[PDB]
Amino acid sequence: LCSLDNGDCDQFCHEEQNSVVCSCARGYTLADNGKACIPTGPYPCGKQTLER
């Protein structure tokens, strides 16, 4: 469930229609496995600008 380990989502977790649906901030897409979030451009939100 969410609580457990926050779904195992990288960011937001929700429970809806008996499933755990994770989401991401603006600037990220939910990834294939349904847990990770992928940046969309070079500078996401909440990521140190490490390198360049």
Partner: protein, 241 residues
């Protein structure tokens, strides 16, 4: 900031500084997008003309990056009471967008509920700023960071001499002398969840910087989330909710 450390390049990229008529900074802000900055409504009253500067880590130097933007429209919460610093939030809309780049990135806005259950129940948050540094950190214009644990409302309400409404939340150490000080107001209070940072507060006030028994109080961004959101869609003056 009293006794924290400095920000390494890349480390605190959603930090904005507000400068006044004599290019002296007075408050700080958090970058939310290429057009908006969040700061503490009271800051509107510490200078008569101000601009926002980003990509800077040493107030008396230019390293590169360092951009200055002008404001176009600013939303201040219309329920801001100068006497309580309640509803202490304002969002600025700039005139020219920010070119995010090394040392200039936004902070993420969490989504209310999730924020409540995960970030706000974390053990600590981190705050940053360029103001008053009373400790052992050579130079006085560097950008600092300090990790403050969250305090529980009872112990907050029972320490502060003034009210704590549900839009304020307290953070800091009780005896250790590390804290948000004058010149960090407006600045960001961000919580890290799995290597991503979301903003949980805006530095609001304190009863002295690192006074034993007092903590610093921040605005409850989670209680302004939808407000912020609408504010980022409009281009008006105060508005509420």
């Amino acid at each position: 900031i009293v006794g924290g450390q400095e920000c390494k390049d890349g480390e605190c990229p959603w930090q904005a500084l507000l400068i006044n008529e004599e290019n002296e900074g007075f408050c700080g802000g958090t970058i939310l997008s290429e057009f908006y900055i969040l700061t503490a409504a009271h800051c509107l009253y510490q200078a008569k003309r101000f601009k926002v500067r980003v990509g800077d880590r040493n107030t008396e130097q230019e390293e590169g990056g360092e951009a200055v933007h002008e404001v176009e429209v600013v939303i201040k919460h219309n329920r801001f009471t100068k006497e309580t610093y309640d509803f202490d939030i304002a969002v600025l809309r700039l005139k020219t967008p920010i070119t995010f780049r090394m040392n200039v990135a936004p902070a993420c806005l969490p989504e209310r509920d999730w924020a409540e259950s995960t970030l706000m129940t974390q053990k600590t948050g981190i705050v940053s700023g360029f103001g008053r540094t009373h400790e052992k950190g050579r130079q006085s214009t560097r950008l600092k960071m300090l990790e403050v644990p969250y305090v529980d409302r009872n112990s907050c309400k029972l320490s502060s001499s003034f009210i704590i409404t549900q839009n304020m939340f307290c953070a800091g150490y009780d005896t250790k002398q590390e804290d948000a000080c004058q010149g960090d107001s407006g600045g960001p209070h961000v919580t890290r969840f799995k290597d991503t940072y979301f903003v949980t507060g805006i530095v609001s006030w304190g009863e002295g910087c690192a006074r034993k028994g007092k903590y610093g109080i921040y605005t409850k961004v989670t209680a302004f989330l939808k407000w912020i959101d609408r504010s980022m869609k409009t281009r008006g003056l105060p508005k509420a909710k």
